[PDB]
Design a protein around this ligand. Sequence first.
Ligand SMILES: COC[C@H](C)n1c(-c2cn3c(C)nnc3c(NC(C)C)n2)nc2cnc(N3CCOC[C@@H]3C)cc21
Length: 127
Amino acid sequence: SMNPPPPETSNPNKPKRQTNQLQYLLRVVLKTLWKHQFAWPFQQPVDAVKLNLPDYYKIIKTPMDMGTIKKRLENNYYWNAQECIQDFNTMFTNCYIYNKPGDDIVLMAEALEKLFLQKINELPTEE
Ligand SMILES: COC[C@H](C)n1c(-c2cn3c(C)nnc3c(NC(C)C)n2)nc2cnc(N3CCOC[C@@H]3C)cc21
């Protein structure tokens, strides 16, 4: 099985805006998670070919990853903070669905999710 193309990240038929919360989601939330010691399995789409996981896209139909989230923020793909927050949550949920409890990858996702939830409790004020 081939990999699917990565999720869309820059769509010129979507309107674009800068907001306090979107800027914080890139500069603080994404940045803080990206630097974590266990972020690396989440910094790009799952390469099912390279990783020999031929059933990955048979099970996960809404893939998401921080590399895609980063590019979506950089190219104004999101209009509302909730869209970005939803993508981070989809990333974590996919990890929990595909893998088993206690697997190294799941323990890594749990550590990142704890940090994510802390940082999104500190969003700046909305316009
Ligand atoms: C700790 O993850 C190891 C794992 C193999 N792995 C994942 C990954 C990401 N996943 C998400 C998201 N949800 N489920 C999985 C998942 N599940 C499997 C464990 C069943 N694996 N992404 C990776 C990216 N790169 C690499 N490496 C590049 C450098 O050389 C070495 C190695 C090949 C390994 C990667």
